[PDB]
Design a binder for this molecule. Structure first.
Ligand SMILES: N[C@@H](CCC(=O)N[C@@H](CS)C(=O)NCC(=O)O)C(=O)O
Ligand SMILES: N[C@@H](CCC(=O)N[C@@H](CS)C(=O)NCC(=O)O)C(=O)O
Lengths: 214, 214
């Protein structure tokens, strides 16, 4: 009747999947769980018809999905965006994982009681990872050349988070600073970011030391 | 000249990729880094021709890969094992991620100074995740029906690790206990496990609290 996507009303793990959607102009509704609704999830968690219950979920009627990365890859696969030959898939997946080292690097520490000191060790390695992305862009509009691919949205999302973490981490990465602006200047994403549908905060689950609250 | 796969001489993140290989009878050589060889990696790390240097790496000459999950998906894609329609990819990827919640659950805590207490909270949630896998198998030889898929090897690997963690965690999961035996009873894997080529330990990087040492 119309694709469903369920998650907490935070950016978290599905923010990118949201942006891919907006970029594709796919129609979808959203089940959004408020912080105060742990019980509500707990019940609809057990009955939606999933074999690996979890959040986020994505229901096409055609399918019932539960893993964050499958859900986004499945959207891209619906639109023939995962790659033609293997060398292509494989490489998209590489960008994928490389962007996940950054986004998970953040997530891994955000809910710990030692965040501020774990912080110092992440921003240290970050540049290193940041750079690979900069060099990758010395010659390609987007992460995989001309045509947008889902990790361009992963990558977007990751810069957005690290910037709240250290506003300057992209001083020294002009190429990355233009990519974040570019993705922004794309009409569909342009609209979504100023739409009512946009969720600007929290970055992580609310309880989180970093990116928590309101 | 012959596919290369490089990693530390531990099971770690590539053990499953190794098992897929052995199951496919693909020929490959291995660059194995001993614990004492951090400097050696550090030099060959910078020159192999990778845009996202890292371990593991997989060099087909046809391609130069670096993310653990892409490398294994790329092997499966070489053999037409990632799925026919999208509903297929998507679902394989689901098994994928669901098995990664378990394997990363372990990895996330193994190198921490509070392991033993973090331990207690993992084995708690484990059953929950374990079960999804058991129910998934009430009616399918393998994780995706009759034909073996790469998460069957991920899943294998994950049971192997958690068993060193708690030898009984599979009492209560007879269906899972037969799957671990089955995968074992497959001639190719049968051979590899008793071959010289097999790496039985360490589970994690050597420095690790859990699964470290020799
Ligand atoms: N690996 C999974 C992780 C899922 C996950 O950790 N979900 C959390 C939110 S960050 C959820 O609260 N779990 C809901 C539940 O377990 O019922 C994915 O990529 O989707
Ligand atoms: N997300 C990456 C993680 C890679 C990774 O963490 N590799 C560690 C071993 S567990 C390696 O020592 N990094 C080597 C390096 O950074 O040079 C993957 O899936 O391959």
């Amino acid at each position: 009747m119309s694709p469903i996507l369920g998650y907490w009303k935070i950016k978290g793990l599905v923010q990118p999947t949201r942006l891919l959607l907006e970029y594709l102009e796919e129609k979808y509704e959203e089940h959004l769980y408020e912080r105060d609704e742990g019980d509500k999830w707990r019940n609809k968690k057990f009955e939606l018809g999933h074999e690996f219950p979890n959040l986020p979920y994505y229901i096409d009627g055609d399918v019932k999905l539960t893993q964050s990365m499958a859900i986004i890859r499945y959207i891209a696969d619906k639109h023939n965006m995962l790659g033609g030959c293997p060398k292509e898939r494989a490489e998209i997946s590489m960008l994928e994982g490389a962007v996940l080292d950054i986004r998970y690097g953040v997530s891994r520490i955000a809910y710990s009681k030692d965040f501020e000191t774990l912080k110092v060790d992440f921003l240290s390695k970050l540049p290193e990872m940041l750079k690979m992305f900069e060099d990758r862009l010395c010659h390609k509009t987007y992460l995989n050349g001309d045509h947008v691919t889902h990790p361009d949205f992963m990558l977007y999302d990751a810069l957005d988070v690290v910037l709240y973490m250290d506003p300057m981490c992209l001083d020294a990465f002009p190429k990355l600073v233009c990519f974040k602006k570019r993705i922004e200047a794309i009409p569909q994403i342009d609209k979504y970011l100023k739409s009512s549908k946009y969720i600007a905060w929290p970055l992580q689950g609310w309880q989180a030391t970093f990116g928590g609250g309101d």
